[PDB]
Amino acid sequence: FMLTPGNPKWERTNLTYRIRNYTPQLSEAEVERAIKDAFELWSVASPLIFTRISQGEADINIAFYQRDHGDNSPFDGPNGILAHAFQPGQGIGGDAHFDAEETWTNTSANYNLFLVAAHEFGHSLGLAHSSDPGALMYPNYAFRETSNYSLPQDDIDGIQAIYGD
Ligand SMILES: O=C(O)[C@H]1Cc2ccccc2CN1S(=O)(=O)c1ccc(-c2ccccc2)cc1
Ligand SMILES: [Ca+2]
Ligand SMILES: [Ca+2]
Ligand SMILES: [Zn+2]
Ligand SMILES: [Zn+2]
Known part of the structure; x- marks a missing residue:
């Protein structure tokens, strides 16, 4: 594992998204469940707790965008870059963006x-x-069974190195 340069990390354990x-491509419930379970992977291996809010300012914004989307890291259409996220911090910090042009399943x-969100x-x-x-x-995407997926050792x-001892 490798920690992001500067060792940026959340200084609070209960985070909102x-x-x-x-x-x-999917129902709203399927998108919500994929996100929920993705956060849960990290939650079960650290002291972090994630709480979803329906409107308002959350620590981690999650959205599907196409090409230029206001952050100077434009998406590129089908395939290639699938998504990206920002290191812990205020504002754009922690936010996760997914390329709206992908076939999401x-x-x-x-x-x-679920897998791409977990990585992000x-x-x-x-x-x-x-x-x-x-x-x-x-760095590269690959499918793994998701039904009872748990974080690789x-x-x-890595997460214990940041939010552990
Ligand atoms: O790394 C990123 O977040 C983004 C942005 C970025 C920035 C700098 C360097 C490389 C990349 C590559 N991409 S990406 O879209 O190609 C990607 C997304 C998910 C996974 C993945 C790995 C394992 C399991 C499941 C998903 C891999 C790569
Ligand atoms: Ca893409
Ligand atoms: Ca944020
Ligand atoms: Zn973006
Ligand atoms: Zn990545």
């Missing part, structure tokens, strides 16, 4: 939203990319 919009087909949240919490090819924080090591 808000799903700002949706993707036509809750299956083994590209691209499983690692960034939102302060983790950089791992060089362990089996880590959720590895390397990611546990």
Whole structure:
């Protein structure tokens, strides 16, 4: 695992998040469940607690955007970059954006939203990319069974390094 340069991290353990919009590819409940379970992966290996809010200012904004979307990191259409997130901090800090032009799924087909969201949240919490090819924080996407998914040991090591002892 690798911690993001500067070691940015949340100084509060209860964080809020808000799903700002949706993707036509899945139902709203499917998007909400993928996000909830993605946060839960990290939650069960750290002292962090995530609370969803329906409107208002949340610590972590989550949204689906296309191409230019106000942050100087434009998406690129189908495939290629799937999503991105900002390191812990105020404002844009911690926010996770997903490329609206992707085929988002809750299956083994590209691209499983739950898995991509889980990876992005690692960034939102302060983790950089791992060089362990089996880590959720590895730089390239790959499907893994999701029904009873749990964080690979390397990611546990990483989150414990930040929010542990
Ligand atoms: O890394 C990112 O967040 C973004 C932005 C970025 C910025 C700098 C360098 C590389 C990348 C690559 N991408 S990405 O869209 O191609 C990507 C997204 C998810 C996963 C993944 C890995 C394992 C399991 C499930 C999903 C991998 C890559
Ligand atoms: Ca893309
Ligand atoms: Ca934020
Ligand atoms: Zn963005
Ligand atoms: Zn990444």
